[PDB]
C-alpha cells in the first residue's frame, strides 16, 4: 500500500546522479536529503524502505550515537572524518540510524547542526536521517536535513503486509484454510521481522511433526507466543 509512496520518495532520492536532464539543466538541486522515522522503529522498517537504493549503489550505515557518550567528549571530529570520507567517496549514500556536560552537548549539537547543513559544501552526497521518534529530537534538525519532503509510516492498509507476506510466502507451503485478511488486518504496527518471525516460528513449530505444510491453527498458535510476549511487559 506504499508503492506510490516508495516510488515518490524513490524519485525524490534517485534524481541526483541519475536522470540528469531533469536534475541540473532545469535546476532542481536539492542538496540536503530527507529525514525518515518509524513508530515501530527497529531499523528493519526504515531499512526495508531505504533498501531499494542499496540494490545498485554504495551504502554507508552508522547506527546509534552511543560513540559520543561512551567516551570523552572528543566532539564532532568523527562526523568530520565521515564528511571527508564522504567527499572522497562522493558516489555513495549517507544514512544515520538511531539518532538519540550539558554545555558541551549544546555546542556539539549546534556544531553538528551547522556541519550537517553544509554551508561550505554543495551537492556531493545525500544524507538521510533516521530515529525512533521525531518528537524526542529537537526540531532544529529539520531545516538542514528535511527541506524537500517528509513521510510518515502508514497504517495496515492490507496491501503492504499482503505484498510482503506474498514475497516471504512465494515458495512456502501453506494450507487452504490459512486466510490472509485476518492476519494482515489483525496485526497493527508490525515490521517485516515480526511477520517473518511468526512465519519462522510457525514453520519451526510445524516441523515438530515432520509436517512440511503449515496450518492456520499452528500459525495462530505460534502467534500467541508473540502476542503474549509483547503484552507481558
Amino acid at each position: 500500500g506504499l508503492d506510490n509512496q516508495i516510488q515518490e520518495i524513490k524519485e525524490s532520492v534517485e534524481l541526483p546522479l541519475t536522470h540528469p536532464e531533469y536534475y541540473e539543466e532545469m535546476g532542481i538541486k536539492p542538496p540536503k536529503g530527507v529525514i525518515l522515522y518509524g513508530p515501530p522503529g527497529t531499523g528493519k522498517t526504515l531499512l526495508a524502505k531505504a533498501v531499494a537504493n542499496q540494490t545498485s549503489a554504495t551504502f554507508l550505515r552508522v547506527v546509534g550515537s552511543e560513540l559520543i557518550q561512551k567516551y570523552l567528549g572528543d566532539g564532532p571530529k568523527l562526523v568530520r572524518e565521515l564528511f571527508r570520507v564522504a567527499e572522497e567517496h562522493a558516489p555513495s549514500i549517507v544514512f544515520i540510524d538511531e539518532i538519540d556536560g550539558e554545555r558541551e552537548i549544546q555546542r556539539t549539537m549546534l556544531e553538528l547542526l551547522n556541519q550537517l547543513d553544509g554551508f561550505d559544501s554543495r551537492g556531493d552526497v545525500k544524507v538521510i536521517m533516521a530515529t525512533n521518534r521525531i518528537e524526542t529530537l529537537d526540531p532544529a534538525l529539520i531545516r538542514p536535513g528535511r527541506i524537500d519532503r517528509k513521510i510518515e509510516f502508514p497504517l495496515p492498509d492490507e496491501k503492504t503486509k499482503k505484498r510482503i507476506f506474498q514475497i516471504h510466502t512465494s515458495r512456502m507451503t501453506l494450507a487452504d484454510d490459512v486466510t490472509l485478511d485476518d492476519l494482515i488486518m489483525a496485526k497493527d504496527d508490525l515490521s517485516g521481522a515480526d511477520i517473518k518471525a511468526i512465519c519462522t516460528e510457525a514453520g519451526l513449530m510445524a516441523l515438530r511433526e515432520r509436517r512440511m505444510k503449515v496450518t492456520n491453527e499452528d500459525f495462530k498458535k505460534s502467534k500467541e507466543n508473540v502476542l503474549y510476549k509483547k503484552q507481558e511487559g
Binding site: 516471504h168 515458495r171 512465519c199 519462522t200 514453520g203 519451526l204 516441523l207 512440511m212 510476549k229 511487559g233
Partner: protein
C-alpha cells in the same frame, strides 16, 4: 569430553535448543521454507545448576566443534592473540565453534579491566551484528552468580532467547548428582533419591556443595567408599551457610 553419559536432566531444554544450535548443523535447508537467521545466543539465569558448562561442552562435543572461551580460564587466555581480531580470525578459520565464558561467572579496577572485556564483547557483537565471516558462530552467556548484572540487564529477552531456570527439572539436583556420583568411587547400597530430593530451598548448587563439602568427611574418616551418611552430613554442612 563430557558427552551425554556425563550430563542429563534437561531433555526438554535440549529438545528446545536443538533448533537454536543444531539447526545449522544437520538441516540447513529450511532457510527458504522458514526464513531463519543467526540469533545472538542463549543464556540460563538463576542458581548454578552444577553442569552449566558441561552442557555447552556436551553440545559442542556432539557438534564436533572447538571450544574457545574469551576470558581464558585454563591457559587459553593469551594462546589465541589489540587482542580483539585474533578471535575473529580463528573464528573465520574454524567455522564450527561455541563460545562460553566461565571465569567471568573491587568496582574500581576489577570493573575497569572487566569493563574492557565487556567493551571487547560489545564491539565483537557490533562487528558480528554488522557483518559476518562464517556461520556457526554463537555466544552463550552465564548468569549463575550474584555479580552477574550486565548480562542479565542487557539481555531482557527482546532480541535474544530467555529460559526461566530456577527449577530446571529437579534432575539438576537428582540425576546430575548421580552422574557426579558415577565419577567418584560409589558403593552399591546408596539411595541418592531421598538425599537428593530432601534439599529444597537453599540453592541448586546442592550437588557440588554436597560432593565437595562431603569430601572433607570422606577425607576425615578416610573411607574407601562414600556412604549416604556422609552426604547426610554434607546437607547440614551446606545449609549452615544459608
Amino acid at each position: 569430553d563430557s558427552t551425554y553419559e556425563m550430563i542429563g536432566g534437561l531433555d526438554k531444554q535440549i529438545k528446545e535448543i536443538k533448533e537454536v544450535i543444531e539447526l545449522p548443523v544437520k538441516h540447513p535447508e529450511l532457510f527458504e521454507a522458514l526464513g531463519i537467521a543467526q540469533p545472538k545466543g542463549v543464556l540460563l539465569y538463576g542458581p548454578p545448576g552444577t553442569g552449566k558448562t558441561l552442557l555447552a561442552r556436551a553440545v559442542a562435543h556432539h557438534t564436533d566443534c572447538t571450544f574457545i572461551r574469551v576470558s581464558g580460564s585454563e591457559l587459553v587466555q593469551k594462546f589465541i592473540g589489540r587482542m580483539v581480531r585474533e578471535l575473529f580470525v580463528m573464528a573465520r578459520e574454524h567455522a564450527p565453534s561455541i563460545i562460553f565464558m566461565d571465569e567471568i561467572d573491587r568496582l574500581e579496577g576489577g570493573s575497569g579491566g572487566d569493563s574492557e572485556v565487556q567493551r571487547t564483547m560489545l564491539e565483537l557483537l557490533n562487528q558480528l551484528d554488522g557483518f559476518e565471516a562464517t556461520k556457526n558462530i554463537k555466544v552463550i552467556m552465564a548468569t549463575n552468580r550474584i555479580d552477574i548484572l550486565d548480562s542479565a540487564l542487557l539481555r531482557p529477552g527482546r532480541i535474544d532467547r530467555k529460559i526461566e531456570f530456577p527449577p530446571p527439572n529437579e534432575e539438576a539436583r537428582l540425576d546430575i548428582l548421580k552422574i557426579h556420583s558415577r565419577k567418584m568411587n560409589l558403593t552399591r547400597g546408596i539411595n541418592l533419591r531421598k538425599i537428593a530430593e530432601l534439599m529444597p530451598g537453599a540453592s541448586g548448587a546442592e550437588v557440588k556443595g554436597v560432593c565437595t563439602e562431603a569430601g572433607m568427611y570422606a577425607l576425615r574418616e578416610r573411607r574407601v567408599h562414600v556412604t549416604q551418611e556422609d552426604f547426610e552430613m554434607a546437607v547440614a554442612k551446606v545449609m549452615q551457610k544459608d
